[PDB]
């Protein structure tokens, strides 16, 4: 369906295969966009379920069960791109041995797109596709989210690394309570509280814990991609949009008359370009799709009728992830809102 994403992914694993993970190493913007594109094209490989094997609860088994993973053209093309050099490199990686950046990225992305957990068990077994047991399916999906994040955090703890983060795609958060996964992953692992370990993942899960997935009457804007939908009541940092797999070019619907700044691309003079929208209804970005080295995904909510506790998520230096890994900020103790003279308005 999309071979360009696979080619870019392969080239980036070859480039980063020998790059050791240091204390402040972070995924470059280009690599992050490559990961984003590969995940979203894996999702687009199968746009709808088969009516003969549809899950009555509505869970997206098309990206969870092996019955549909093995039918995805994208998965087969990526595992057999150029005689499967990536697949051969994958069959030797393990949570407890990854030391390089390329290994980290390859293992996480291949586990995700193969419908596999880190311990080898599938996300959802082929016999539970047409199941009605809500608790079992929900627990399986919740375990998939928790295990992806926990695997990333255990890597970061072993390598003593900060700012590495890939994120769990939105489809894995089906009936998943963000607060429950956040507390399960941070009250059972005391070593994860260190201020030098996985702060991007910390910010991702903290935001997903304070903000629920579905806010009925407290939503300000909605994302939908392939029907998988999310609602936000706060400024949406780029790490959240990148972890969930939502682009600013997807369908955004706007429920109030607030002003949003949709950051779109990085321009010259070390700035960012944004669009402003105020009307209720759909939000349409008429600009061309940016390249992987300058793509940006973030939304700022101007509203002032909100708690001051979560206003730092809209700060420019936190909403937009820094190119320099050491300048990235993930908490209110380091958030700062400076340097708007470099930004420009498109529309």
């Amino acid at each position, epitope marked *: 369906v999309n071979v360009a994403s696979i080619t870019a992914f392969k080239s980036m694993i070859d480039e980063t295969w020998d790059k050791k993970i240091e204390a402040n190493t972070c995924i470059s913007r280009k690599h992050r966009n490559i990961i984003h594109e590969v995940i979203r094209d894996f999702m687009k490989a199968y746009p709808k379920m088969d009516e003969n094997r549809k899950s009555p609860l509505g869970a997206p088994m098309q990206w969870l069960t092996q019955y549909y993973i093995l039918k995805n053209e994208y998965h087969k093309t990526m595992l057999a791109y150029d005689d499967g050099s990536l697949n051969t490199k994958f069959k030797t990686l393990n949570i407890y041995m990854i030391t390089n950046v390329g290994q980290y990225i390859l293992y996480i992305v291949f586990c995700i797109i193969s419908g596999k957990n880190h311990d080898g068990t599938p996300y959802i077994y082929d016999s539970e596709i047409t199941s009605n047991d809500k608790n079992l399916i929900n627990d399986r999906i919740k375990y998939a989210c928790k295990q992806i994040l926990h695997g990333q955090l255990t890597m970061a703890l072993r390598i003593r690394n900060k700012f590495m983060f890939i994120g769990s795609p939105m489809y894995l958060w089906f*009936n998943v309570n963000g607060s429950h996964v956040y507390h*399960e992953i941070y*009250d059972r692992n*005391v070593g994860f509280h260190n201020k030098e370990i996985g702060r991007l993942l910390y910010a991702f899960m903290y935001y997903l814990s304070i903000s*629920g997935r579905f806010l*009925n009457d407290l939503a300000l804007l909605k994302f939908t991609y392939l029907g998988e939908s999310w609602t936000f009541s706060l400024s949406v940092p780029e790490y959240i949009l990148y972890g969930l797999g939502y682009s600013v070019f997807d369908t955004i619907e706007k429920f109030s008359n607030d002003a949003i700044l949709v950051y779109i691309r990085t321009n010259n003079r070390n700035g960012y370009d944004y669009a402003e929208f105020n009307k209720k209804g759909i939000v349409k970005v008429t600009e061309d799709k940016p390249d992987n080295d300058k793509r940006i995904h973030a939304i700022r909510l101007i509203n002032y009728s909100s708690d001051v506790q979560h206003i730092h998520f809209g700060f420019r230096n936190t909403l937009i992830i820094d190119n320099e890994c050491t300048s990235i900020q993930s908490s209110a103790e380091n958030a700062t809102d400076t340097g708007h003279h470099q930004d420009s308005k498109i529309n």
Partner: antibody, heavy 118, light 107 residues
Framework: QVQLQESGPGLVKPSETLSLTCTVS????????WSWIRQPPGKGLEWIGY???????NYNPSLKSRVTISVDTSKNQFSLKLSSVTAADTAVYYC??????????????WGQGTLVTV | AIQMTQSPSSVSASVGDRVTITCRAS??????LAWYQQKPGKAPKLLMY???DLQSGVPSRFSGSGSGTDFTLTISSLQPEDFATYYC?????????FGQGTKVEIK
């Protein structure tokens, strides 16, 4: 048959500290969540916080500025310290344990409940 | 926080009749509701952990129902043992909040 019993002083003057210790007999702290809950006289129930045996704690934002829950697995006891107790802090304090199931967020075992007055 | 509202605040019901207690959620909680029984002078006893799942040591006359915003605990046949205050606890977000306890008393 895990039995929880609260202890500590029952009378604390206003603006001082409040100490409550819960002892777990017939079981262990090693694998479950332990929470403190209070009941204002004839009003209702309000959750204070919990401590996991590892040491991590979660507090109620309403009074997170003056609550401190501690655990001591060597003595099978987890305590609570409330600072600057006001006249509204009079209540019956229960030391609960959470469900040891796939659900860990409900209170399965409760203590006797010690009333403390200010 | 998620305010828990219970209605009626007190109900007197005949022994052998049907008692219904409703606990409305300020914001939607998806089945993370537990119901507790507190006899006077005793600590709460967990009756139902999820919206409809019944603990061991609890008589089968207790039926849990509803999911989302609306919830209902029902007693099929009231017994003199069931004189208690009933509380609803939500576990969807933090802090964990209990509702105002509904008294049920035998008439």
């Amino acid at each position: 048959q895990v039995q929880l019993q609260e202890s500590g002083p029952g009378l604390v003057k206003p603006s001082e500290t409040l100490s409550l210790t819960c002892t777990v007999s017939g079981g262990s702290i090693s694998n479950y969540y332990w929470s403190w809950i209070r009941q204002p006289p004839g009003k209702g129930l309000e959750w204070i916080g919990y401590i996991y045996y590892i040491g991590t704690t979660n507090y109620n934002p309403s009074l997170k500025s003056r609550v401190t829950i501690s655990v001591d697995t060597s003595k099978n006891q987890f305590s609570l310290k409330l600072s600057s107790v006001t006249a509204a802090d009079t209540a019956v304090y229960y030391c609960a344990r959470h469900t040891d199931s796939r659900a860990w967020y409900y209170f399965d075992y409760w203590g006797q409940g010690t009333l403390v007055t200010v | 926080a998620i305010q828990m509202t219970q209605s009626p605040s007190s109900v007197s019901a005949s022994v052998g009749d049907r008692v219904t207690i409703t606990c409305r959620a300020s914001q939607g909680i998806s089945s993370w509701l537990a119901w507790y029984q507190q006899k006077p002078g005793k600590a709460p006893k967990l009756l139902m952990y999820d919206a409809s799942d019944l603990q061991s040591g609890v008589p089968s006359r207790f039926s849990g129902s509803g999911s989302g915003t609306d919830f209902t605990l029902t007693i099929s046949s009231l017994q003199p043992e069931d004189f208690a205050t009933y509380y609803c606890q939500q576990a969807n977000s933090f802090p964990w909040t209990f509702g105002q306890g509904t008294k049920v008393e035998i008439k």
